[PDB]
Amino acid sequence: PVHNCDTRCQTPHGALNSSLPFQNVHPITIGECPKYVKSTKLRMATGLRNVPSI
Amino acid sequence: GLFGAIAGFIEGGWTGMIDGWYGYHHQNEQGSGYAADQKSTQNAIDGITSKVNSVIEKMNTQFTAVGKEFNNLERRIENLNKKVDDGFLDVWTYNAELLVLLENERTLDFHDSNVRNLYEKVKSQLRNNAKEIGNGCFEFYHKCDDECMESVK
Ligand SMILES: *[C@@H]1O[C@H](CO)[C@@H](O[C@@H]2O[C@H](CO)[C@@H](O[C@@H]3O[C@H](CO)[C@@H](O)[C@H](O)[C@@H]3O)[C@H](O)[C@H]2NC(C)=O)[C@H](O)[C@H]1NC(C)=O
Ligand SMILES: *[C@@H]1O[C@H](CO)[C@@H](O[C@@H]2O[C@H](CO)[C@@H](O)[C@H](O)[C@H]2NC(C)=O)[C@H](O)[C@H]1NC(C)=O
């Protein structure tokens, strides 16, 4: 359906609002959108091995 | 390369330490420890922040791209179009997954090097009067108070 918010990215499955560099929803974009890929999990570690003490 | 400190000769981490990633644990005449080391963790935070911001800013944003149309007599160009789009899609997803899978061991070995260097510093400026015992501790042949604790730190 059609509604009246205002975004900067548009896909056939809805609109996107993010600043991440990658994207998963649909490979046809209008506006300024992050890059479409074909993966599921791109978690990136900033920290240590969580090793608890016994 | 695993430098040997995290889950190595040092046992697992500390729950009670809060405000950092690298700290000390003193047991002087009047208290217990769990105080951070704000020098080395600051360089760690700045390095990882520059790392993540660089990885963000290298990937360019894509502009408008709309699928096209063809009649029944231009199947050749349409197959060429589909080959182009799938080839670029495979190259980009390969580069993304490979970049993350190298960056993870890079940052874990970075933390391991930070632990080992912070241990070598404390050992090197306590060259005799320390009596190391195991898993990163020292036992102080002389007497020490909070002043010489911060003098170590
Ligand atoms: C790193 O740690 C050393 C530990 O020796 C620091 O030196 C000590 O700094 C404290 C800061 O409060 C000084 O304590 C007070 O100084 C005033 C002014 O003389 C005095 O009125 C108090 O009675 C008390 O002594 C202390 O004098 C000073 N020195 C020693 C031998 O403890 C040092 O400042 C820290 N920072 C750096 C960048 O080195
Ligand atoms: C898109 O998402 C961003 C990030 O959440 C939104 O930015 C903030 O959103 C909160 C809650 O809506 C607001 O209180 C802040 O004022 C927003 N910050 C700024 C700088 O605007 C943003 O509002 C979202 N936009 C849309 C159209 O959904």
Short mmCIF file of N, CA and C in Angstrom, two decimals, chain A residues 6-51:
data_model
loop_
_atom_site.label_atom_id
_atom_site.label_comp_id
_atom_site.label_asym_id
_atom_site.label_seq_id
_atom_site.Cartn_x
_atom_site.Cartn_y
_atom_site.Cartn_z
N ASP A 6 8.42 9.88 4.66
CA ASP A 6 9.45 10.34 3.73
C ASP A 6 10.75 9.63 4.06
N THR A 7 11.25 8.86 3.10
CA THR A 7 12.47 8.08 3.27
C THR A 7 13.49 8.50 2.23
N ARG A 8 14.63 7.81 2.24
CA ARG A 8 15.69 8.03 1.27
C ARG A 8 16.02 6.77 0.49
N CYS A 9 15.29 5.68 0.72
CA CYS A 9 15.52 4.41 0.06
C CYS A 9 14.18 3.74 -0.15
N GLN A 10 14.00 3.09 -1.29
CA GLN A 10 12.72 2.46 -1.58
C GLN A 10 12.92 1.15 -2.32
N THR A 11 12.28 0.10 -1.83
CA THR A 11 12.29 -1.23 -2.39
C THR A 11 10.86 -1.66 -2.68
N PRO A 12 10.66 -2.68 -3.52
CA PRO A 12 9.30 -3.22 -3.70
C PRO A 12 8.71 -3.88 -2.47
N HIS A 13 9.50 -4.26 -1.48
CA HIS A 13 8.96 -4.85 -0.26
C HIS A 13 8.79 -3.84 0.86
N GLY A 14 9.00 -2.56 0.59
CA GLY A 14 8.87 -1.54 1.60
C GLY A 14 10.04 -0.58 1.56
N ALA A 15 10.12 0.29 2.56
CA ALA A 15 11.16 1.30 2.61
C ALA A 15 12.24 0.91 3.61
N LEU A 16 13.43 1.47 3.43
CA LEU A 16 14.56 1.21 4.29
C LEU A 16 15.02 2.49 4.96
N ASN A 17 15.38 2.38 6.23
CA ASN A 17 15.97 3.48 7.00
C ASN A 17 17.11 2.88 7.81
N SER A 18 18.34 3.04 7.33
CA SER A 18 19.51 2.54 8.03
C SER A 18 20.74 3.29 7.54
N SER A 19 21.88 3.01 8.18
CA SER A 19 23.17 3.52 7.76
C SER A 19 24.21 2.42 7.65
N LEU A 20 23.79 1.16 7.74
CA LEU A 20 24.71 0.05 7.56
C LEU A 20 25.12 -0.05 6.09
N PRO A 21 26.32 -0.56 5.81
CA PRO A 21 26.78 -0.61 4.42
C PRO A 21 26.24 -1.77 3.60
N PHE A 22 25.50 -2.70 4.20
CA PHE A 22 25.02 -3.85 3.46
C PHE A 22 23.52 -3.99 3.62
N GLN A 23 22.93 -4.90 2.85
CA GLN A 23 21.49 -4.88 2.64
C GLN A 23 21.05 -6.26 2.17
N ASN A 24 19.83 -6.64 2.54
CA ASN A 24 19.38 -8.02 2.38
C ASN A 24 18.00 -8.16 1.75
N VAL A 25 17.21 -7.09 1.66
CA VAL A 25 15.78 -7.25 1.39
C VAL A 25 15.54 -7.56 -0.08
N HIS A 26 15.97 -6.68 -0.98
CA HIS A 26 15.62 -6.86 -2.39
C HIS A 26 16.66 -6.17 -3.25
N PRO A 27 17.02 -6.73 -4.40
CA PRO A 27 18.08 -6.12 -5.23
C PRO A 27 17.63 -5.03 -6.20
N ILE A 28 16.42 -4.49 -6.07
CA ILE A 28 15.97 -3.39 -6.92
C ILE A 28 15.68 -2.21 -6.01
N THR A 29 16.55 -1.20 -6.04
CA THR A 29 16.47 -0.08 -5.12
C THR A 29 16.31 1.22 -5.88
N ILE A 30 15.61 2.17 -5.26
CA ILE A 30 15.48 3.53 -5.77
C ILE A 30 15.82 4.50 -4.65
N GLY A 31 16.77 5.39 -4.90
CA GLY A 31 17.19 6.38 -3.93
C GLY A 31 18.68 6.31 -3.67
N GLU A 32 19.05 6.21 -2.40
CA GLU A 32 20.43 5.96 -1.99
C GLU A 32 20.39 4.85 -0.95
N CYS A 33 20.79 3.65 -1.35
CA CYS A 33 20.54 2.47 -0.55
C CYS A 33 21.82 1.68 -0.36
N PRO A 34 21.94 0.93 0.74
CA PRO A 34 23.10 0.05 0.91
C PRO A 34 23.09 -1.10 -0.09
N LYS A 35 24.24 -1.75 -0.19
CA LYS A 35 24.49 -2.69 -1.27
C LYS A 35 23.85 -4.05 -0.98
N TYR A 36 23.15 -4.59 -1.97
CA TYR A 36 22.50 -5.88 -1.83
C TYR A 36 23.52 -7.00 -1.84
N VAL A 37 23.35 -7.97 -0.95
CA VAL A 37 24.18 -9.17 -0.90
C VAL A 37 23.27 -10.39 -0.78
N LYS A 38 23.90 -11.55 -0.63
CA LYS A 38 23.22 -12.83 -0.60
C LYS A 38 23.72 -13.65 0.58
N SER A 39 23.72 -13.03 1.76
CA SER A 39 24.18 -13.68 2.98
C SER A 39 23.11 -13.55 4.05
N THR A 40 23.41 -14.07 5.24
CA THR A 40 22.48 -14.04 6.36
C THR A 40 23.04 -13.41 7.61
N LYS A 41 24.35 -13.44 7.82
CA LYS A 41 24.91 -13.04 9.11
C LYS A 41 26.26 -12.39 8.87
N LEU A 42 26.37 -11.11 9.20
CA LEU A 42 27.60 -10.34 9.06
C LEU A 42 27.95 -9.65 10.36
N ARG A 43 27.92 -10.40 11.45
CA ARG A 43 28.31 -9.86 12.74
C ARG A 43 29.83 -9.71 12.79
N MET A 44 30.28 -8.57 13.29
CA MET A 44 31.70 -8.23 13.31
C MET A 44 32.12 -7.93 14.73
N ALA A 45 33.20 -8.56 15.17
CA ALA A 45 33.59 -8.55 16.57
C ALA A 45 34.41 -7.31 16.89
N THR A 46 33.99 -6.57 17.92
CA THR A 46 34.78 -5.48 18.49
C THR A 46 34.89 -5.77 19.98
N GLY A 47 35.80 -6.66 20.35
CA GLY A 47 35.92 -7.05 21.74
C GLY A 47 36.60 -8.40 21.88
N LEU A 48 36.44 -8.99 23.05
CA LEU A 48 37.27 -10.09 23.50
C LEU A 48 36.49 -11.39 23.51
N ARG A 49 37.22 -12.49 23.68
CA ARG A 49 36.60 -13.79 23.86
C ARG A 49 35.97 -13.86 25.24
N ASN A 50 34.65 -13.99 25.29
CA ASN A 50 33.94 -14.01 26.56
C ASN A 50 34.18 -15.36 27.22
N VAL A 51 35.25 -15.44 28.00
CA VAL A 51 35.60 -16.66 28.71
C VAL A 51 35.28 -16.44 30.19
#
